[PDB]
Amino acid sequence: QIDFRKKINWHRRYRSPQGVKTEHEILRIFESDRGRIINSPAIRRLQQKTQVFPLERNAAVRTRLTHSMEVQQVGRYIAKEILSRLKELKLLEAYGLDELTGPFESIVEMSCLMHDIGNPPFGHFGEAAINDWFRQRLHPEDAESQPLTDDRCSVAALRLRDGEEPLNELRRKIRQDLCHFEGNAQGIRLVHTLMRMNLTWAQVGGILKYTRPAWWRGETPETHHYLMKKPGYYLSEEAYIARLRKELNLALYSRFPLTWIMEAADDISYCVADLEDAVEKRIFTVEQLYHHLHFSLVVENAWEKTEDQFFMYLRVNTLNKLVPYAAQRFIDNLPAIFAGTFNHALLESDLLKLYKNVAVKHVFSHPDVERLELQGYRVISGLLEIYRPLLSLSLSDFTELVEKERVKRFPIESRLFHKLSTRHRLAYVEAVSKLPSDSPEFPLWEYYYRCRLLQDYISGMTDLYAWDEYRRLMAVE
Amino acid sequence: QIDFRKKINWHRRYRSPQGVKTEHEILRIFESDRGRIINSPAIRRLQQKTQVFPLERAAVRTRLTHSMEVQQVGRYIAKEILSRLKELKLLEAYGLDELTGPFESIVEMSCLMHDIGNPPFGHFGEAAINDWFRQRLHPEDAERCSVAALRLGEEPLNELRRKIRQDLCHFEGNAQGIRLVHTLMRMNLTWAQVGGILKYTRPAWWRGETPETHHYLMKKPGYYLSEEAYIARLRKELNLALYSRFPLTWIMEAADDISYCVADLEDAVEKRIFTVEQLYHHLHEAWGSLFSLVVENAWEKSRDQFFMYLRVNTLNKLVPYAAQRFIDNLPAIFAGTFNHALLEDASECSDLLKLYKNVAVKHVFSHPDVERLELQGYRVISGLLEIYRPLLSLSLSDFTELVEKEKRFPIESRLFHKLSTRHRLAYVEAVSKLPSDSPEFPLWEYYYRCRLLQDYISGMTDLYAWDEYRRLMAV
Ligand SMILES: Nc1nc2c(ncn2[C@@H]2O[C@H](COP(=O)(O)OP(=O)(O)OP(=O)(O)O)[C@@H](O)[C@H]2O)c(=O)[nH]1
Ligand SMILES: Nc1nc2c(ncn2[C@@H]2O[C@H](COP(=O)(O)OP(=O)(O)OP(=O)(O)O)[C@@H](O)[C@H]2O)c(=O)[nH]1
Numbered sequence: 001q002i003d004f005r006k007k008i009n010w011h012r013r014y015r016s017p018q019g020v021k022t023e024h025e026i027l028r029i030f031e032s033d034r035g036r037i038i039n040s041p042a043i044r045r046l047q048q049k050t051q052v053f054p055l056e057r058n059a060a061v062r063t064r065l066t067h068s069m070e071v072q073q074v075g076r077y078i079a080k081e082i083l084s085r086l087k088e089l090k091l092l093e094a095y096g097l098d099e100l101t102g103p104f105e106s107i108v109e110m111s112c113l114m115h116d117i118g119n120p121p122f123g124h125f126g127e128a129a130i131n132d133w134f135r136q137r138l139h140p141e142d143a144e145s146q147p148l149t150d151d152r153c154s155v156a157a158l159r160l161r162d163g164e165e166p167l168n169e170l171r172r173k174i175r176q177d178l179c180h181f182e183g184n185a186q187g188i189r190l191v192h193t194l195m196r197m198n199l200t201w202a203q204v205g206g207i208l209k210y211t212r213p214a215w216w217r218g219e220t221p222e223t224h225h226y227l228m229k230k231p232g233y234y235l236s237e238e239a240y241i242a243r244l245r246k247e248l249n250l251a252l253y254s255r256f257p258l259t260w261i262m263e264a265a266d267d268i269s270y271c272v273a274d275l276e277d278a279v280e281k282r283i284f285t286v287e288q289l290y291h292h293l294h295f296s297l298v299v300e301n302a303w304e305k306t307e308d309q310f311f312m313y314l315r316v317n318t319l320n321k322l323v324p325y326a327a328q329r330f331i332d333n334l335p336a337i338f339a340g341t342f343n344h345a346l347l348e349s350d351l352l353k354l355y356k357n358v359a360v361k362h363v364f365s366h367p368d369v370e371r372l373e374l375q376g377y378r379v380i381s382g383l384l385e386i387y388r389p390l391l392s393l394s395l396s397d398f399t400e401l402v403e404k405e406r407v408k409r410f411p412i413e414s415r416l417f418h419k420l421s422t423r424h425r426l427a428y429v430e431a432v433s434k435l436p437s438d439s440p441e442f443p444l445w446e447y448y449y450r451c452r453l454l455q456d457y458i459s460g461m462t463d464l465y466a467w468d469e470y471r472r473l474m475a476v477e
Numbered sequence: 478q479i480d481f482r483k484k485i486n487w488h489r490r491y492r493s494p495q496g497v498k499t500e501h502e503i504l505r506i507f508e509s510d511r512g513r514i515i516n517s518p519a520i521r522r523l524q525q526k527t528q529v530f531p532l533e534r535a536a537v538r539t540r541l542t543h544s545m546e547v548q549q550v551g552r553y554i555a556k557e558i559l560s561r562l563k564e565l566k567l568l569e570a571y572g573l574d575e576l577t578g579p580f581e582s583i584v585e586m587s588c589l590m591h592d593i594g595n596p597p598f599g600h601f602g603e604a605a606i607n608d609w610f611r612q613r614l615h616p617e618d619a620e621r622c623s624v625a626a627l628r629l630g631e632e633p634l635n636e637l638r639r640k641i642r643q644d645l646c647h648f649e650g651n652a653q654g655i656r657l658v659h660t661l662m663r664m665n666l667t668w669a670q671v672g673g674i675l676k677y678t679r680p681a682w683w684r685g686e687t688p689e690t691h692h693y694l695m696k697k698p699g700y701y702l703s704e705e706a707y708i709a710r711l712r713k714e715l716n717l718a719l720y721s722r723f724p725l726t727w728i729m730e731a732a733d734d735i736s737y738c739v740a741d742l743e744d745a746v747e748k749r750i751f752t753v754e755q756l757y758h759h760l761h762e763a764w765g766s767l768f769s770l771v772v773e774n775a776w777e778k779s780r781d782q783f784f785m786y787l788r789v790n791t792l793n794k795l796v797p798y799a800a801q802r803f804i805d806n807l808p809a810i811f812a813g814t815f816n817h818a819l820l821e822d823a824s825e826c827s828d829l830l831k832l833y834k835n836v837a838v839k840h841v842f843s844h845p846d847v848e849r850l851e852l853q854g855y856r857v858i859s860g861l862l863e864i865y866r867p868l869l870s871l872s873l874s875d876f877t878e879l880v881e882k883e884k885r886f887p888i889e890s891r892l893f894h895k896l897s898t899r900h901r902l903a904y905v906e907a908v909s910k911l912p913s914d915s916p917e918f919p920l921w922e923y924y925y926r927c928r929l930l931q932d933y934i935s936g937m938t939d940l941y942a943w944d945e946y947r948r949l950m951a952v
């Protein structure tokens with residue numbers, strides 16, 4: 001049976017609120033989360049990360065922040081609709097939402113704002129660059145089978161030792177997980193291990209969009225084929241997610257009920273924003289666009305009601321038709337959505353597919369846009385190659401470097417090690433300290449956390465900072 | 478007597494929603510406003526406009542990130558006012574039982590839009606505009622003016638000259654915000670939403686000494702001579718007395734007062750002007766009291782942890798105080814006549830903020846880098862104005878000819894085209910309305926032509942204004 005008291009969990013991991021709390025008391029807990037997220041540097045960093053078009057000095061353009069802000073509005077509208085409908089259906093009290101009314105819309109809003117928090121500089125091409133670079137170091141293709149003699153993996157510790165070990169399973173997991181960087185998973189890593197935000201279990205649940213472990217090697221089960229689409233969390237966060245699952249009464253590979261809303265909100269916001277920016281950047285006129293789109297109720301109607309006015313009314317019409325649909329879909333499939341087992345999105349739609357198609361054919365295909373995707377990949381690929389010496393080091397050597405911060409045998413490695421943000425470096429120390437040194441899997445775990453350290457640093461950079469750092473360290477600035 | 482149904486007005490200026498509406502129907506009206514504002518280019522432009530420190534390559538606050546943080550304080554205050562009103566059983570009594578959401582939504586959007594009308598280099602962009610216009614049409618004399626039409630034998634027409642001369646030298650971001658949401662952006666927001674962004678009630682053209690009764694509300698200019706008619710309708714629509722403020726503005730104001738410096742001290746430590754320790758010391762220098770309760774308490778938890786707990790403590794003391802102040806003075810606040818802020822001087826609470834202001838003034842705003850940017854900004858805007866001076870130099874017939882057939886004026890034409898269509902349209906729209914036969918027609922035209930230029934400049938982002946200066950300087 002459906003009881004949102006069981007899902008909207010107002011407890012925290014560390015220094016947790018306990019006891020019996022008033023409707024107001026619980027409200028203030030969730031309002032504290034809002035403050036944490038809004039005043040977070042991780043969120044301020046988004047105004048420097050780019051959405052589609054590069055950041056200009058004529059930049060009426062959207063950034064990851066302005067877009068995330070617009071998604072937050074869609075999410076609010078959807079949640080507000082789900083609740084207004086549930087109230088009309090007299091189900092609000094029946095589902096336990098009568099007192100958790102505000103936290104419900106607040107969780108959705110903050111999950112929307114945070115939905116792009118772990119994306120790396122250059123987005124899909126920053127992801128590409130990281131995975132491709134790590135793939136060429138520790139070949140995960142080789143670990144799927146039995147320990148091969150020509151194991152291409154360069155990391156001596158991570159090479160599969162010849163029919164000898166179940167320790168080989170850790171190697172498989174480490175090799176695959178490190179080649180499966182995903183912004184979604186990095187977001188969980190970031191909110192927990194890195195930013196140490198200490199959000200409520202319910203708030204963290206909302207940003208777990210996928211349930212596939214990064215290290216996953218097989219083909220996802222038919223039952224959860226959709227929820228396991230992309231990796232949702234890393235091998236480092238395995239334990240955290242395992243508690244989150246317990247705290248939110250989630251089955252294995254089940255999603256948090258509210259995530260379907262943030263997802264739907266994201267689906268609506270996807271292109272419409274970027275077509276508005278394409279007209280601004282002058283790729284085409286509002287007229288030219290109306291032609292490529294060429295349904296009557298949304299697009300034609302908005303054209304009749306010039307530049308800002310068309311998009312203001314395209315957005316309105318789109319929302320006024322899609323928001324109620326998503327809200328209805330959610331209520332209609334609430335049993336499965338509640339269990340976290342529902343294997344579809346709220347909009348599984350043709351109107352959105354139309355916007356996607358026009359944007360793909362005439363905006364994401366633009367030479368300027370495709371030349372930043374090429375450049376971005378070069379930058380991140382370069383950056384990784386610059387810090388390669390840290391991963392090249394032996395455990396004893398790297399350990400020595402972490403201990404007496406400045407080492408004389410390694411001048412370059414020391415200097416590069418200091419470049420890494422203290423927040424990430426701390427997380428390494430903290431994680432590696434927890435492991436038992438005597439353990440045979442200790443060197444395997446250390447290398448994993450050392451790689452994770454580097455991935456954390458790079459993904460943590462803003463688009464511009466990564467570009468600068470590349471040019472500075474290339475000795476061209 | 479206090480009935481928020483009368484103040485939370487969900488009607489629009491153009492193609493207005495009409496009739497009897499469900500709680501849900503009214504909700505969707507106010508949610509449409511949110512969408513309009515959030516997806517507005519005027520709001521996206523804020524991430525390019527600077528709050529204190531220059532825009533670097535990143536963790537620093539821009540006008541947008543700050544406005545976003547104010548929005549949170551405003552939400553917290555409004556949410557408190559409503560939780561308290563509910564406990565007092567007054568929610569139904571004040572008509573707020575159904576307008577519960579629009580109440581917190583109006584506060585939130587008025588917070589995001591406080592700063593929207595601010596020109597490129599803030600108080601220095603304001604400075605540059607007013608000083609430039611002051612040296613053209615001397616308003617001191619109307620209580621030297623180069624504009625032949627605007628120079629004062631006799632005439633009551635002279636009163637328009639006085640109004641035009643003072644109004645043009647009294648550019649204010651707050652007033653520009655009203656101009657921008659109405660005439661320029663043409664956002665078609667609800668009357669209630671517009672009410673929330675009218676922070677001051679003084680007409681820009683005002684020359685006298687503000688009446689003692691409204692001395693505070695008339696602190697700075699709240700609206701221009703061009704928006705006179707608009708405000709007159711807004712006043713009617715929101716049942717506001719002359720020079721009275723919208724009830725909810727006191728909340729956005731209080732939210733703004735709290736957010737003021739704390740943000741910038743956090744950024745000063747980031748930019749490495751001082752250490753958290755150095756800061757704790759200067760705060761001590763400036764003063765079991767509120768001080769121990771907020772600052773000392775936050776330092777103990779830490780020795781980001783310091784600022785996280787400074788913010789929390791500050792808010793947990795100030796938010797309920799503001800909420801209480803608002804409920805306590807609700808009759809006057811509702812009438813719009815209340816002549817104080819929610820956190821006014823006397824209070825120990827106000828003194829905590831004054832402390833943050835003092836530390837930031839002495840060690841942050843006084844920073845050479847900060848001051849360099851201020852000097853530079855003034856130079857840019859001053860320069861930019863001087864670049865477009867030829868448009869204001871033109872005779873009415875000549876300028877009119879230019880607006881019509883978009884040859885004798887190559888430079889003026891080209892400069893006229895540089896002006897954003899949105900502002901140029903607003904000029905045409907405004908000047909078209911005026912009766913040509915009228916003797917005050919040339920006076921009105923010049924006013925709108927000047928307003929056109931002020932709109933263009935203030936409309937620029939910090940960076941765009943800097944670029945445009947260097948481009949037009951042929952560098
Ligand atoms: N430059 C560029 N941008 C794109 C392209 N396709 C989509 N986008 C934009 O980039 C984003 C890509 O969306 P997703 O792939 O869903 O990104 P995401 O939501 O973080 O990924 P998921 O969370 O896994 O869905 C969208 O928000 C679009 O604005 C493309 O081919 N090129
Ligand atoms: N660079 C700089 N920034 C300052 C200084 N004093 C204040 N600020 C910043 O400017 C912001 C706004 O200051 P105000 O001009 O008083 O307020 P406002 O938001 O423009 O609105 P009103 O007071 O209603 O006109 C503060 O929150 C600070 O971030 C200063 O001397 N230099």
Ligand SMILES: [Mn+2]
Nearest residue numbers: 067116266270
């Ligand atoms: Mn997105």
Ligand SMILES: [Mn+2]
Nearest residue numbers: 543592733737
């Ligand atoms: Mn301010």
